[PDB]
Amino acid sequence: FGGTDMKKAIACLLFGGSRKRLPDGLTRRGDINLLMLGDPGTAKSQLLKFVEKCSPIGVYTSGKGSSAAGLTASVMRDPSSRNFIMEGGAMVLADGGV
Amino acid sequence: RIQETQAELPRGSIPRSLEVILRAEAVESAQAGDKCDFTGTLIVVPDVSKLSTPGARAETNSRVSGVDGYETEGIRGLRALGVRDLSYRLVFLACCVAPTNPTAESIKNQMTVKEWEKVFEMSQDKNLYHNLCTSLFPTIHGNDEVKRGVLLMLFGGVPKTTGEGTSLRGDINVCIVGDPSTAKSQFLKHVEEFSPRAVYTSGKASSAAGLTAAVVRDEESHEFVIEAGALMLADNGVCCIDEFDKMDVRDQVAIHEAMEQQTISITKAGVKATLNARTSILAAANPISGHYDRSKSLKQNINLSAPIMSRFDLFFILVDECNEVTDYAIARRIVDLHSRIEESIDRVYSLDDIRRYLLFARQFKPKISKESEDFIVEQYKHLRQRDGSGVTKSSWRI
């Protein structure tokens, strides 16, 4: 119930903007970032879950990551066989998603 | 495997370890943690990887030489002459194993008529409550409450099980907290000396694998064998822990697990096993500031976790008086020890008699009488009512 403006903001979030590289090699962000501050019980988490389901690519996480997955990527070296391993984080696992 | 005892150690030397082999009927005896005398032979057994350098070796007396195309080179020549490396090790074979110093009906039958006479004489004395306090602790002055508590912990209670699958503790655990030099480690040392199966450990000296258990592979067969820790060697005995605060929090977690479940679970090296640890714990701890603060509760004076704090049956607190006449009474005893090396002791019962009586006494499983039910109910009611607001705060809460 309610939040028509909020729903429209979420829709334009889902569609997203357009990214633009430049001749100098510099880039400019083409994606939208939103913040929602509110009292408990204001139906915020449900919108996030609906966005996660609606978008073709979507990851839902909290602060400090998830149960067994971090929020950012990390790099290690295998001592037995020398290979540079990288662990996918919640941000790396999404490309073009929400 | 056997080890050389401490009394035989020379200056600055680690105890010697030896391997003993049991055949047929003698196989049964000599369990882990014992202190036993062996009688047998000393025998030489070959070894493989002793010689990284060439040494004494065997050969054949035949005067045989090679022929062209079959010349006695290294490998073929060594194999043709049957050369074997003479390496050896020392192994003890045992034919008699005995205790160094030696089911209630079985215990009664084992004892002789004179031993049973002594046991019966001990049995019907009220001074048994008093004299046992003085016998085990002749030199320590005062602190009779701690002596009584330690004796009660030694005798222990009765374990029971319920119909729902739960189990109830039958052991008693004791903690002592006190100011410096209040004979706090003397009780631990005396209990270690008296008890036949007791292990004394300091907080930081013992590791996690030192307690609990370890798993290693059998030398010959495919099976596995278990190395017992301090708690397993002290099974159905007393474990003494000095400087209880110095133990790691995770070691304290393991100790609490052993105190609650009374079971050690091992899942390592392809072996899953459960072992029984029915130990009674005697622990000594220091105040946080090095002295007991009279203005604060017990929970604010010790750095111990709440669960293990609640698991302990009894806490004893020792505080040193400054200039009371006891300073004289203490001194008179101490010099009495130095002036009289062995003649200043008036023990009533020898330690062996006490051990025999304790072994006989631990077999009993007394029940709870009907009047005792109501008496305990009313006494617990009074104890809880003591917690009322009409009187000052107490260290505990009931």
Add this chain to the structure above:
Amino acid sequence: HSVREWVSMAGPRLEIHHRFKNFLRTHVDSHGHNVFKERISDMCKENRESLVVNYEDLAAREHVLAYFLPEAPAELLQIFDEAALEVVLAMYPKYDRITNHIHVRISHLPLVEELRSLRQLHLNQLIRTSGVVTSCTGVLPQLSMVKYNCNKCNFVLGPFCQSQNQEVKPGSCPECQSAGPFEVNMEETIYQNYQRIRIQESPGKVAAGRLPRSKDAILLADLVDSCKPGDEIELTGIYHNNYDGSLNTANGFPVFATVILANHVAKDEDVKMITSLSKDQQIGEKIFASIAPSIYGHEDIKRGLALALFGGEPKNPGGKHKVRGDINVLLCGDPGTAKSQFLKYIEKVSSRAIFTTGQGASAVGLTAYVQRHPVSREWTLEAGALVLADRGVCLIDEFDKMNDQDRTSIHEAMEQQSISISKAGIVTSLQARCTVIAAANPIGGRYDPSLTFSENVDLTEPIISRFDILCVVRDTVDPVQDEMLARFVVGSHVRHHPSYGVEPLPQEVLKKYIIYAKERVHPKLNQMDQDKVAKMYSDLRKESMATGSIPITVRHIESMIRMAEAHARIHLRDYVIEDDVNMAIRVMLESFIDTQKFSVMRSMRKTFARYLSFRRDNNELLLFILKQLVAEQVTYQRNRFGAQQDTIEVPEKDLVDKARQINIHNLSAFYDSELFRMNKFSHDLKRKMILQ
């Protein structure tokens, strides 16, 4: 000569075969019925492959076979198998198409010594042991009747029987006379079921001062997967040496390894009864009182756990709005209130319940990880306790002691109902549809009535908000309650030495009712009353804002609905009525009010006495008033006198006035009530007084 030597020769072999055939054909029970008749008939009805024989009957009928059985098991078992196969094929001719062999297993025996006593004397004999299973290798295809392909030509060598002692090595190809090599014809070979088990002594039977010992056993054919790890079993088997590789040769003494080969293992109207119990008008109170027989008091907690166990119903219109039906429970209590016993009972009752502790060293972890298992030595993905309890209950003890990872995983599993894993090249999402029940202690070690629930507990507000029901167990010195609790404890201790609700249902009946209600009861909300709910919600929010702390939110209403559904599931109602709604209202209001501090709680309790009094007892309220007055008098006596007096007395006028304030004008039934006598109260008309 040895027993096996006499067994080997053909004469006594055929004679014993005939004797066993006659024993099979002529054996009858104590009532004259042919035992093997019914046995083989019921075996035939399910196309089974095994037959069970008792040593007692075998010894009674034919003594020589029983005498020879222990000291020559393999050949005698083979002969008995042949005889049984002949008899069965005589009874039915179709098994030549179905099963070409039948095994004979010995069921009962004179009990043989434990694992300690097995020594050289028991080699190649028949023994019976008891132990505890610790590991299993799974099911493995072993060879039997092997066909080999020659590698020079392509001839197929005939079937060879695979003995358990040595591998089969064919001599030469019958046609080209080659000496090898040969390989196994995979398509034409026959295979058998094989499993390996490790058995350890029961820890209760081990004498003090020594350690439990273990031994290995092998199960074949129908015996596979008949035991779970951690169970207690009894085997009848053969103590064996003659298998290749038993002798230690490379180094050390000439030591042999022993193995045991086992051949036996020894560990409609209900729906009508459920409907009949549902027909009873007071089934709900029976179920409420049926929970936790061994715990005294805490009736409200048991009532809440009833709804938690029965549960609700998830709802998801389309694939957009998911709403769970699992009712989580949180308990916060002072030490000694027996919070863990509730979790133990719930684990015992629940069909699928997982238990874990946050302090550390738990048997089951709370976080998924990929690891080589220490026992099976296999690369496994071990999910947490949350994943394992799909459509089940997860229990967490010592909720405050949990570290960062456990809190994060619990928050993710409670709010999203799924667990995400990104470890060792594995990216997964797993379902965590489970009900969470937790127990905890306050921050200072004692609950403070002057502070809110959040200030008393180490947990955070987002975690608390997830739980539908919060229960607070505060320890307070009540002499009568303490006396009753002590009486129960001492009675339990004495009983277990080695030498309101009319009647609770049996535990198995309760389990069956729970299963049936979960499977076949789906209450419908087609008769809800929105007007009363909306008005009550508005009034609750209004007075919450008037007090000025912790306002109510829509989430609570959802919980109410779920609880209502749970209540409708208790009575097997297919539709929701006002009684369930009012009960859920009472539960939700109690939970909400109990989390407030002193003044706010008192004001809310006084104002909302209308709703909280649904199906309540006036006598209980009067008892509460009397207890409050008694406590006030006792506190005054203790503060002024410095000690309690021998008697407690209270005028009736104060009780009457307070009852009038709660709109109660008669108290004779309260005087005659059982609650009055249980607390040892008396009423004297000679002085118009109440004495305790």
Add this chain to the structure above:
Amino acid sequence: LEEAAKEVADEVTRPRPSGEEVLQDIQVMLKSDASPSSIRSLKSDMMSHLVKIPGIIIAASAVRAKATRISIQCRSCRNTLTNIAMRPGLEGYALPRKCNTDQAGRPKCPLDPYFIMPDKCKCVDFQTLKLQELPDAVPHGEMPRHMQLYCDRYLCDKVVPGNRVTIMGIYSIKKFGLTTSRGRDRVGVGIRSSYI
């Protein structure tokens, strides 16, 4: 069926561009609507038959090379045996020991004269996978069971670890000769490692 498919493909696409006359092999995959069965139901009776099983993939090894046609050479006379067909699955091959050439008057070749020529062999892709029982169907209080899977040619890289897959295959055993048991444990007799 693969030979029939190759012949049909030759029939339909005869006028190919010049130079590429070589007709290559064709892999035939299977698919069905039959409902699956539990992995726990796999027992001795299902050997060398066709089974359908669900699972979750937890490990996938690297793609390697396996030979299907080999050619070997003799030490002395340098004669060659060509176009020897290898068997599919985890099965090996044993080289012959005798040189099969008629030589009268000439001296003869020694014993075991054959060497494998690597540059004259046909190779295909090879992969092994590890499959675990579904958590949705694992019995309460029981450790999950595992299985090893063999992937050949075009089936490689179709599955990423973490996916939930349904697999149709043949239940088999490895065949690397009658090797002796190893290790300090020798209880098991006549056990061949199984796979799908």
Add this chain to the structure above:
Amino acid sequence: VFGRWDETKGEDNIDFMPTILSRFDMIFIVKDEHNEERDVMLAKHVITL
């Protein structure tokens, strides 16, 4: 920051530094607003759902 919004305090209700807040495009603030007749509609909508 305090668990529930405090309108009169204005600022200091948000703990984030302005640097991280700059990266957001739109910021929404939601409050539990007292409306006696709106609660009836919300309850009816919820029960209807």
